[PDB]
Design an enzyme around this catalytic site. Sequence first.
Site, mmCIF file in Angstrom:
data_model
loop_
_atom_site.group_PDB
_atom_site.id
_atom_site.type_symbol
_atom_site.label_atom_id
_atom_site.label_comp_id
_atom_site.label_asym_id
_atom_site.label_seq_id
_atom_site.Cartn_x
_atom_site.Cartn_y
_atom_site.Cartn_z
ATOM 1 N N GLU B 57 0.811 -1.240 0.000
ATOM 2 C CA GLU B 57 0.000 0.000 0.000
ATOM 3 C C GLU B 57 0.846 1.293 0.000
ATOM 4 O OE1 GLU B 57 -0.453 -2.619 2.108
ATOM 5 O OE2 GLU B 57 -2.550 -3.300 1.772
ATOM 6 N N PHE B 119 -10.338 -7.307 15.342
ATOM 7 C CA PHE B 119 -9.284 -7.609 14.398
ATOM 8 C C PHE B 119 -9.137 -6.464 13.379
ATOM 9 C CE2 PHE B 119 -8.067 -9.924 10.389
ATOM 10 C CZ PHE B 119 -6.701 -10.111 10.735
ATOM 11 N N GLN B 120 -7.947 -5.866 13.320
ATOM 12 C CA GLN B 120 -7.580 -4.742 12.442
ATOM 13 C C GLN B 120 -8.337 -3.437 12.665
ATOM 14 O OE1 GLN B 120 -7.752 -6.393 8.392
ATOM 15 N NE2 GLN B 120 -5.715 -7.437 8.607
ATOM 16 N N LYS B 169 -16.996 -1.088 7.225
ATOM 17 C CA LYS B 169 -17.485 -2.104 6.284
ATOM 18 C C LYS B 169 -19.036 -2.167 6.271
ATOM 19 C CE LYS B 169 -16.956 -7.239 5.151
ATOM 20 N NZ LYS B 169 -15.938 -7.960 4.238
ATOM 21 N N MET B 500 26.725 5.063 3.709
ATOM 22 C CA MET B 500 25.577 5.975 3.811
ATOM 23 C C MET B 500 25.801 7.047 4.897
ATOM 24 S SD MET B 500 21.957 3.867 3.419
ATOM 25 C CE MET B 500 22.340 2.563 4.563
HETATM 26 C C1 LIG Z 1 -10.604 -15.317 10.352
HETATM 27 C C2 LIG Z 1 -9.827 -15.678 11.641
HETATM 28 C C3 LIG Z 1 -9.890 -16.980 12.168
HETATM 29 C C4 LIG Z 1 -9.189 -17.308 13.340
HETATM 30 N N1 LIG Z 1 -9.301 -18.574 13.829
HETATM 31 C C5 LIG Z 1 -8.684 -18.904 15.043
HETATM 32 C C6 LIG Z 1 -8.804 -20.259 15.710
HETATM 33 O O1 LIG Z 1 -9.460 -21.142 15.178
HETATM 34 N N2 LIG Z 1 -8.126 -20.519 16.909
HETATM 35 C C7 LIG Z 1 -7.371 -19.525 17.504
HETATM 36 O O2 LIG Z 1 -6.750 -19.664 18.542
HETATM 37 N N3 LIG Z 1 -7.281 -18.260 16.885
HETATM 38 C C8 LIG Z 1 -7.897 -17.956 15.664
HETATM 39 N N4 LIG Z 1 -7.720 -16.686 15.156
HETATM 40 C C9 LIG Z 1 -6.809 -15.843 15.841
HETATM 41 C C10 LIG Z 1 -7.623 -15.162 16.949
HETATM 42 O O3 LIG Z 1 -8.513 -14.245 16.325
HETATM 43 C C11 LIG Z 1 -6.743 -14.424 18.031
HETATM 44 O O4 LIG Z 1 -5.826 -13.581 17.422
HETATM 45 C C12 LIG Z 1 -5.972 -15.434 18.869
HETATM 46 O O5 LIG Z 1 -6.754 -16.587 19.245
HETATM 47 C C13 LIG Z 1 -5.537 -14.687 20.093
HETATM 48 O O6 LIG Z 1 -4.688 -15.536 20.803
HETATM 49 P P1 LIG Z 1 -4.472 -15.263 22.371
HETATM 50 O O7 LIG Z 1 -5.731 -15.026 23.136
HETATM 51 O O8 LIG Z 1 -3.543 -16.421 22.765
HETATM 52 O O9 LIG Z 1 -3.464 -13.996 22.439
HETATM 53 P P2 LIG Z 1 -3.680 -12.516 22.858
HETATM 54 O O10 LIG Z 1 -4.752 -11.771 22.148
HETATM 55 O O11 LIG Z 1 -2.274 -11.895 22.977
HETATM 56 O O12 LIG Z 1 -4.257 -12.506 24.337
HETATM 57 C C14 LIG Z 1 -3.395 -13.051 25.356
HETATM 58 C C15 LIG Z 1 -4.137 -12.718 26.682
HETATM 59 O O13 LIG Z 1 -3.132 -13.011 27.669
HETATM 60 C C16 LIG Z 1 -2.946 -11.852 28.468
HETATM 61 N N5 LIG Z 1 -1.600 -11.877 28.927
HETATM 62 C C17 LIG Z 1 -0.505 -11.413 28.302
HETATM 63 N N6 LIG Z 1 0.597 -11.656 29.065
HETATM 64 C C18 LIG Z 1 0.186 -12.258 30.220
HETATM 65 C C19 LIG Z 1 0.838 -12.750 31.400
HETATM 66 N N7 LIG Z 1 2.202 -12.584 31.555
HETATM 67 N N8 LIG Z 1 0.112 -13.367 32.378
HETATM 68 C C20 LIG Z 1 -1.178 -13.465 32.226
HETATM 69 N N9 LIG Z 1 -1.845 -13.011 31.153
HETATM 70 C C21 LIG Z 1 -1.191 -12.436 30.112
HETATM 71 C C22 LIG Z 1 -3.289 -10.734 27.580
HETATM 72 O O14 LIG Z 1 -3.594 -9.576 28.405
HETATM 73 C C23 LIG Z 1 -4.467 -11.258 26.831
HETATM 74 O O15 LIG Z 1 -5.694 -11.007 27.564
HETATM 75 C C24 LIG Z 1 -8.407 -16.341 13.997
HETATM 76 C C25 LIG Z 1 -8.341 -15.031 13.458
HETATM 77 C C26 LIG Z 1 -9.051 -14.703 12.288
HETATM 78 C C27 LIG Z 1 -8.978 -13.285 11.701
HETATM 79 C C1 LIG Z 2 -0.845 -5.056 4.377
HETATM 80 C C2 LIG Z 2 -2.145 -5.797 4.081
HETATM 81 N N1 LIG Z 2 -2.956 -5.534 3.024
HETATM 82 C C3 LIG Z 2 -4.118 -6.271 2.771
HETATM 83 C C4 LIG Z 2 -4.482 -7.286 3.613
HETATM 84 C C5 LIG Z 2 -5.789 -8.081 3.355
HETATM 85 N N2 LIG Z 2 -5.468 -9.459 2.910
HETATM 86 C C6 LIG Z 2 -5.515 -10.436 3.832
HETATM 87 S S1 LIG Z 2 -5.061 -12.013 3.116
HETATM 88 C C7 LIG Z 2 -4.768 -11.262 1.575
HETATM 89 C C8 LIG Z 2 -4.304 -12.134 0.432
HETATM 90 C C9 LIG Z 2 -3.116 -12.995 0.942
HETATM 91 O O1 LIG Z 2 -2.422 -13.521 -0.211
HETATM 92 P P1 LIG Z 2 -1.261 -14.578 0.012
HETATM 93 O O2 LIG Z 2 -0.121 -13.886 0.739
HETATM 94 O O3 LIG Z 2 -0.780 -15.025 -1.365
HETATM 95 O O4 LIG Z 2 -1.757 -15.781 0.941
HETATM 96 P P2 LIG Z 2 -2.827 -16.898 0.452
HETATM 97 O O5 LIG Z 2 -4.203 -16.522 0.956
HETATM 98 O O6 LIG Z 2 -2.868 -17.087 -1.025
HETATM 99 O O7 LIG Z 2 -2.303 -18.104 1.101
HETATM 100 C C10 LIG Z 2 -5.077 -9.866 1.659
HETATM 101 C C11 LIG Z 2 -4.952 -9.009 0.435
HETATM 102 C C12 LIG Z 2 -3.638 -7.510 4.721
HETATM 103 N N3 LIG Z 2 -3.939 -8.463 5.724
HETATM 104 N N4 LIG Z 2 -2.486 -6.810 4.905
HETATM 105 C C1 LIG Z 3 12.770 6.409 4.629
HETATM 106 C C2 LIG Z 3 14.057 7.114 4.945
HETATM 107 N N1 LIG Z 3 15.055 6.610 5.766
HETATM 108 C C3 LIG Z 3 16.196 7.287 6.036
HETATM 109 C C4 LIG Z 3 16.430 8.503 5.463
HETATM 110 C C5 LIG Z 3 17.757 9.269 5.732
HETATM 111 N N2 LIG Z 3 18.603 9.279 4.493
HETATM 112 C C6 LIG Z 3 18.556 10.358 3.693
HETATM 113 S S1 LIG Z 3 19.647 10.208 2.304
HETATM 114 C C7 LIG Z 3 20.064 8.590 2.784
HETATM 115 C C8 LIG Z 3 21.016 7.728 1.945
HETATM 116 C C9 LIG Z 3 20.521 7.835 0.471
HETATM 117 O O1 LIG Z 3 21.192 6.814 -0.253
HETATM 118 P P1 LIG Z 3 20.932 6.786 -1.832
HETATM 119 O O2 LIG Z 3 19.492 6.514 -2.142
HETATM 120 O O3 LIG Z 3 21.725 5.634 -2.320
HETATM 121 O O4 LIG Z 3 21.307 8.212 -2.403
HETATM 122 P P2 LIG Z 3 22.817 8.758 -2.613
HETATM 123 O O5 LIG Z 3 23.028 9.837 -1.573
HETATM 124 O O6 LIG Z 3 23.795 7.619 -2.637
HETATM 125 O O7 LIG Z 3 22.724 9.437 -3.940
HETATM 126 C C10 LIG Z 3 19.410 8.289 4.007
HETATM 127 C C11 LIG Z 3 19.669 6.973 4.690
HETATM 128 C C12 LIG Z 3 15.395 8.986 4.659
HETATM 129 N N3 LIG Z 3 15.441 10.231 4.084
HETATM 130 N N4 LIG Z 3 14.257 8.307 4.386
#
Ligand SMILES: Cc1cc2nc3c(=O)[nH]c(=O)nc-3n(C[C@H](O)[C@H](O)[C@H](O)COP(=O)(O)OP(=O)(O)OC[C@H]3O[C@@H](n4cnc5c(N)ncnc54)[C@H](O)[C@@H]3O)c2cc1C
Ligand SMILES: Cc1ncc(C[n+]2csc(CCOP(=O)(O)OP(=O)(O)O)c2C)c(N)n1
Ligand SMILES: Cc1ncc(C[n+]2csc(CCOP(=O)(O)OP(=O)(O)O)c2C)c(N)n1
Lengths: 542, 564
Positions: B57, B119-120, B169, B500
């Site tokens: 993006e 989520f997101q 959405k 650099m």
């Molecule tokens: C389309 C879709 C389908 C999915 N299907 C599944 C599925 O089938 N099964 C699945 O598991 N997930 C699935 N997911 C992923 C799911 O949505 C969650 O992201 C995932 O289950 C979250 O995992 P979690 O609760 O372990 O972690 P987290 O969201 O990180 O939550 C962890 C919890 O632990 C707590 N915590 C953190 N550190 C500590 C600590 N030191 N002591 C005590 N507590 C702590 C946090 O505060 C939090 O409440 C799916 C997601 C999508 C988008």
């Molecule tokens: C940065 C970003 N843009 C868009 C999305 C929405 N999105 C989720 S899955 C997906 C397609 C994933 O393609 P691929 O990496 O080839 O995995 P596949 O489903 O084919 O296994 C998109 C566009 C996203 N999660 N992240």
């Molecule tokens: C996203 C991002 N990271 C870091 C910088 C800092 N920065 C500016 S010029 C440069 C090096 C540029 O290298 P190059 O593209 O090869 O140009 P040159 O000076 O060799 O012509 C950096 C790291 C920046 N401007 N943007």
Amino acid sequence: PDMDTSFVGLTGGQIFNEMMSRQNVDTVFGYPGGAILPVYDAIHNSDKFNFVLPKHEQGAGHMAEGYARASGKPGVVLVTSGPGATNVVTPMADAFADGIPMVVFTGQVPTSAIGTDAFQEADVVGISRSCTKWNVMVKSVEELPLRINEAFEIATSGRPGPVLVDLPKDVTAAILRNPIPTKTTLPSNAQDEFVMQSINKAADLINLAKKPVLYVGAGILNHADGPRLLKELSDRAQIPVTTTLQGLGSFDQEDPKSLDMLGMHGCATANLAVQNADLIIAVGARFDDRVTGNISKFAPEARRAAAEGRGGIIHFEVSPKNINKVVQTQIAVEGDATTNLGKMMSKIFPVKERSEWFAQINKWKKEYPYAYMEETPGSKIKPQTVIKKLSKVANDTGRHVIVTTGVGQHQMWAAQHWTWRNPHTFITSGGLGTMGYGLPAAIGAQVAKPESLVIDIDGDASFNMTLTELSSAVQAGTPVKILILNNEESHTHQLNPDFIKLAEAMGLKGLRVKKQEELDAKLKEFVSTKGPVLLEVEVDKK
Amino acid sequence: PDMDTSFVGLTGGQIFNEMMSRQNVDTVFGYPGGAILPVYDAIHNSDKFNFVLPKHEQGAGHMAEGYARASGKPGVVLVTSGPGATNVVTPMADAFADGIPMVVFTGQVPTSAIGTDAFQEADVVGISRSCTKWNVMVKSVEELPLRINEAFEIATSGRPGPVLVDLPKDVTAAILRNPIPTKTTLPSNALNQLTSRAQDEFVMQSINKAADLINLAKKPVLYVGAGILNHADGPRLLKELSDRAQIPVTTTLQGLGSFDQEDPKSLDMLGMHGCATANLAVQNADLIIAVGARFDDRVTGNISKFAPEARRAAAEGRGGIIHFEVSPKNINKVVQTQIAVEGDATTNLGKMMSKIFPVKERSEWFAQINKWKKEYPYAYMEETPGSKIKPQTVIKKLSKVANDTGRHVIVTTGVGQHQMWAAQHWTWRNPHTFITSGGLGTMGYGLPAAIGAQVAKPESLVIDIDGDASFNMTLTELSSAVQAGTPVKILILNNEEQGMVTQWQSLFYEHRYSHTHQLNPDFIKLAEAMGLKGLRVKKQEELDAKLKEFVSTKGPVLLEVEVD
Ligand SMILES: Cc1cc2nc3c(=O)[nH]c(=O)nc-3n(C[C@H](O)[C@H](O)[C@H](O)COP(=O)(O)OP(=O)(O)OC[C@H]3O[C@@H](n4cnc5c(N)ncnc54)[C@H](O)[C@@H]3O)c2cc1C
Ligand SMILES: Cc1ncc(C[n+]2csc(CCOP(=O)(O)OP(=O)(O)O)c2C)c(N)n1
Ligand SMILES: Cc1ncc(C[n+]2csc(CCOP(=O)(O)OP(=O)(O)O)c2C)c(N)n1
Ligand SMILES: Cc1cc2nc3c(=O)[nH]c(=O)nc-3n(C[C@H](O)[C@H](O)[C@H](O)COP(=O)(O)OP(=O)(O)OC[C@H]3O[C@@H](n4cnc5c(N)ncnc54)[C@H](O)[C@@H]3O)c2cc1C
Ligand SMILES: [K+]
Ligand SMILES: [K+]
Ligand SMILES: [Mg+2]
Ligand SMILES: [Mg+2]
């Protein structure tokens, strides 16, 4: 009252190094530019730190996340002002969603230039406010130790997460002229007996249960001893264990007590055990609706046991805010789960067997395995088959194996069909779902664990987001194994590069599988390759 | 017609599609995901829009910038929730710093899910608040035309810039059931307007002055910036005025192309990396007529020391600084000015024209300017037998080769030394042909900006003069170029053996000691992997033939030149 002269005469850059040392940092991910130069020079120049250079700051941020997930340590990121800082917003939001400790240091224009529309003055603390636990702009070199220590403490406590510390160039270039209070330099450093009461009540309820289930999520991974005490509790009380997606690896799926993954895309057996348990013991898991489904229909036998005074739901949760937020619990044990599991352990009655409960679970395992349409003669390869086969090949190497992924169908197939055995080995973007995560995360995981086999199970569109980091892997000496499950080829069609020629252009070995009969040999060649290697497998479309 | 029934029965996605047409959009840059799907499906499946897909993006965001900069139209971005949205923050910050009109649409979780950490669910209106002119979360489908019309009007008025419209959405999937007010469905109005006697008199008075203050003449200097480029007729009226009163023109980095650098009265670029004659002709100024420029540090300095010969005619009440500026906020913000002319710079020039007293010539000054130049040219160490290739030489040769084609030529760049060499050593003639990240300095801009500029101007020759470190930031968009068919010309000035980071350097700037080297890919094997032609120059003897092939080649092509 107590003053420290030991930094007097140092620049903020050298003070930064010393504070990294005190925080046990030896690895930094980042990318130079003018505003951060006083810190970047100090870190670049010191042999005490491995500075890892990506091609894009987004890459540094996801590397730091992979490093943190693999090592248990905060991932430290160092970038410049303006676009250096705005380029790490996606990885901060990603770490924020998944509870990953990360400390982000951003160069900033001089304090005198703030609010003048200076070149690369971004309001970075404004931008990152909603995707960090905390952030701050440092205003004087006197304050630099304080803020640094504050940042690491916050990133790594409670639910871990990202913090951002904005560093004006005049502050980090300055020489410290005044003593500062000693406390500020030192890594920091009724409710109690409510917590001890709840531990006692949790033990009682576990000791009472006939059909308990441990439901374990990411929080168990936030202490070094979590998986060990989880296993100790599961053995002691003969309790089957199911994990969330982010808990995979916290429990050995080859253990006879493993239920594997719970949820919409989980094991039917895991789901049936949870629906039939008289007691759910939730450990570091947040009751996501992808895990529970319709919450009113969730764990009916546990709800019935609660209604009858003999079971229900126990929740070991570190954030008060997350307690009784989704499900009403009978007992909440507030605080770090590993810690509290250790305090509870001696109160648990050792149970010899739960013959009927495990006989029912094992019957289920038979009746309801994961299923998918497998290959037939001449058909395209199924991604699930690749993953199953590769899980076995990887495991047979005898090595410690870490897996990262992209985002898409392959991410869920990896979760399901890989056999998870060890903690801190499944590194996947679950909370934000950031496409492109897999490769830089693998590079950071590999830096954290240089002896581990590190595999990125990636999708073609995901991989395209961040594939410039392939050259970064070569430069960092990280021999990551990049797997591309390519299911591409009106609808949306993306033109892919030739991935094998790409990998060669980038400096690594490239392999391709097109048909079934090649796959076994190529997977073996893939994991056996000494350096970094990309294997593309052409698979069926869904 | 009070209520508008014409959207009733349509989904938010179909309304979005109709609203793009009403805003005269024919190009959208974006990338699919679940949250933006109702909108994505409505436009990606339409013969009305050219939907251009990047691999990331951020690429869509900088493509939209290049498109806007080349076309004078807003660049429209469409991405999903969560990481889709956070991935366009750098392009918004970039557009915001450079005043580029951009309308960013982000899919969002449903309104009922906001604040459940779904989520997101990102707080994108919060994240993007300091890098947009304005933003909003649409809360119902009724509201959708309203917010789209507001977004385009704000993005393109005043000083142009980015706006963001967050799209839950459930809102874009919903069907509009009730009539909505016509005022909310009709796009607004730049001018096309009416103004009061009061408004007229206000502008006309600041205009009569300055007009008089100029007819006085002396040693005046047009100091011109990006603002002259924000109206189709800016350059014409700049030229006309330069001629009329015979005035020499210098430009900022962002005004390059607004004046023909061949014209005898061109001073070319000023500031830290500008040429001596421009800086001299200013500082020791007199009367500087600042036209759509903001006195950035790199241009001024050096405050008090700035234009004293003008900061004199002010005391002596015979000169000073006139500022044609659109945002009153920016007036007297950096340099205290003697006369402010508020509003669109081009429109005010038009009004001020007639009131301007033609001039014969001024060669007391001219021949003096024509004296600075000889005594102070752009100078650099030019190659000798067997020596390494100099980047300045490449750029000057390439300028000539491009010019030889007789084509309209648009140049984008990355950020770094090569960016300034491009600004300096290319010969700038036509408006909207230098497209470079100036205010934020975003490495990785060059390639996606070129792709977007190429879509805006399909008949133009579009060259990305890029650096090797810059190019690596976004090089995944090479396949996007091939997929879009844009025959962009990507030049990589590869100087990878210098670090650099300058660690120190000799006083008389002769030698620079540097560290931090990045490992580059083989850029020619990479270009071929991505499906385009790749060319490499290693030695002086090859340079001319390769630059000619590079430019002549049909289709997208990457040329790497190894430089000193
Ligand atoms: C389309 C879709 C389908 C999915 N299907 C599944 C599925 O089938 N099964 C699945 O598991 N997930 C699935 N997911 C992923 C799911 O949505 C969650 O992201 C995932 O289950 C979250 O995992 P979690 O609760 O372990 O972690 P987290 O969201 O990180 O939550 C962890 C919890 O632990 C707590 N915590 C953190 N550190 C500590 C600590 N030191 N002591 C005590 N507590 C702590 C946090 O505060 C939090 O409440 C799916 C997601 C999508 C988008
Ligand atoms: C940065 C970003 N843009 C868009 C999305 C929405 N999105 C989720 S899955 C997906 C397609 C994933 O393609 P691929 O990496 O080839 O995995 P596949 O489903 O084919 O296994 C998109 C566009 C996203 N999660 N992240
Ligand atoms: C996203 C991002 N990271 C870091 C910088 C800092 N920065 C500016 S010029 C440069 C090096 C540029 O290298 P190059 O593209 O090869 O140009 P040159 O000076 O060799 O012509 C950096 C790291 C920046 N401007 N943007
Ligand atoms: C490495 C590097 C070096 C640089 N060095 C230089 C240098 O040496 N020389 C140089 O010139 N720049 C240099 N810059 C670029 C500098 O940072 C600025 O981007 C640039 O000077 C801004 O030029 P500008 O004022 O024309 O444009 P803008 O920043 O876009 O400002 C234009 C002004 O015009 C006003 N305006 C806009 N539209 C209108 C309108 N329709 N009517 C009236 N007024 C309007 C705006 O409100 C604004 O105040 C450098 C950048 C980099 C990365
Ligand atoms: K499994
Ligand atoms: K020039
Ligand atoms: Mg795919
Ligand atoms: Mg370079």
